[PDB]
Design a binder for these strands. Structure first.
Length: 124
DNA sequence: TTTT
């Protein structure tokens, strides 16, 4: 079983690109990390930061969770994020999404020993 | 699957 934080890594992290490449980039990656298998995920955002620095967001701004929990954390900084939004046409099987690239703050939920991201919560 |  994939750990919650490994899951996070797979689902939210593309450190080997500073930003989006094509507009196909969401389609390439959503599918690359298997978010298009039974799921057709509605949206997914990808931080183009090193890991080391994204678990750094755990010790930063302690903000509420969109969903009402106290263990979320705002990035003191701006991070480049690509966001992939399901386009009407995307039909699971063969899913499609709009690649939007941004520098923004991201809020992730943390837990465990060690404290790390398990949940990508929001961006601002 | 409303993205822990």
């Amino acid at each position: 079983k994939e750990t919650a934080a490994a899951k996070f890594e797979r689902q939210h992290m593309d450190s080997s690109t500073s930003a989006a490449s094509s507009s196909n980039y969401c389609n390439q990656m959503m599918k690359s990390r298997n978010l298009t298998k039974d799921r057709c995920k509605p949206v997914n955002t990808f931080v183009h930061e090193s890991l080391a620095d994204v678990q750094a967001v755990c010790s930063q701004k302690n903000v509420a969770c969109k969903n009402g929990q106290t263990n979320c954390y705002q990035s003191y900084s701006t991070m480049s994020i690509t966001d992939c939004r399901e386009t009407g046409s995307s039909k699971y099987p063969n899913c499609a999404y709009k690649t939007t690239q941004a520098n923004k703050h991201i809020i992730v939920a943390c837990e465990g020993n060690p404290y790390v991201p398990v949940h990508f919560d929001a961006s601002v």
